[PDB]
């Protein structure tokens, strides 16, 4: 009946409430990056999701299925195991919260850092540092390792036009090498941390679907080969 | 001094933290049915948003600039003055429920409504319930008028995958026709608010600019076809 997996036939299969696996995935250069790792697990996405109205996908495993989301919701969406396993940046994780999450593996890819950063040739002004930023949790602790404390304003955006415009004195983002601010009129200062994409669990998920997970972990594992 | 408005030179003029104007507008189906009002107002884009890497883009006005921002944030740029007037629907502005604004024109575009939504032919679950939902204040606040606490579920990204992969028990959303709703297997439920696109401006940009404001909201006002 079942036999083995092969889903060649794209816009079928994908069923509702999966009790086989549903991976989280991310949903720009993270997706770019992920794609490739998953491809050697066995694991293919049948069509291309930006040109797709789809919101779950079929792969060419029948046991596995995607959903491709805003960052931020990954850990949300396994934290409540409705999906079993996921890949988000560790900047998510540590702003949002691990709980019902195994953080399983450093995949080595989104490779990135979480900065300052500012206008070029500003002056430190005088009183509570206005902080813009999409991670409030982050900067907060940050500022508090300095011993100081800041007004942060939470942006959901484009994180470089606010200091332009005067929103900032300052901003928190995650700094790839540092070209597209400094285009921008805009330079690096400090590094608050490395971050790299993590591949997540949920915890009963774990227990439970210990077959089709064993083997996949094991093969992303490999991927990662390095030293 | 110089009467000298008029601006065909795009990629051109731009400045910076201007004392001129600066307007933030959301960057969905709002921003489309916005632009055809500021026309009446001489006030218009000279290139594609959608194929420029602009983050602040000039207008034939040269006394007027332009930034396309992710809906949530148009209240967040307004409050804090970078930004002197911007346009967001009713439904962003009431669970931001931003401070230093003033509300002076409903435009009555992009007309929707604030609804729960389920599963079609769902059961009413039992213990406290939970909502996949982006609107938490506004939600927490209609369950509060029913006397029912509630468990909320914060999602950034398609309020429409929570469902079928059984994040929630009930979402809250904005329905238009909610067309898009059936063809996922999911119904409008009952209604919280009805909701339209408004015009918010800063208190202290009001009572300075207001020189070059009035002409601009007087234009707009009639353009809305209202008495």
Redesign the interface.
Known sequence: MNDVRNDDPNFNVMG??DHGL?LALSKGRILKETLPLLATAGINLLEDPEKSRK??FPTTHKQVRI?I??A??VP??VE?G??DLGVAGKDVLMEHGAQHVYELLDLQIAKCKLMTAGKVGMERPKGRLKIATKYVNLTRQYYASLGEQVDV??????M???P????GDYIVDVVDTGNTLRA?GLEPLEEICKVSSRLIVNKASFKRKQVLLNPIISQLEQAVQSR
């Open positions: 509702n409430f549903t919101l779950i959903l989301l805003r931020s919701d949300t969406y409540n409705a999906a304003i939470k942006l959901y955006g484009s470089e036009l606010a332009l415009v005067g929103l921008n």
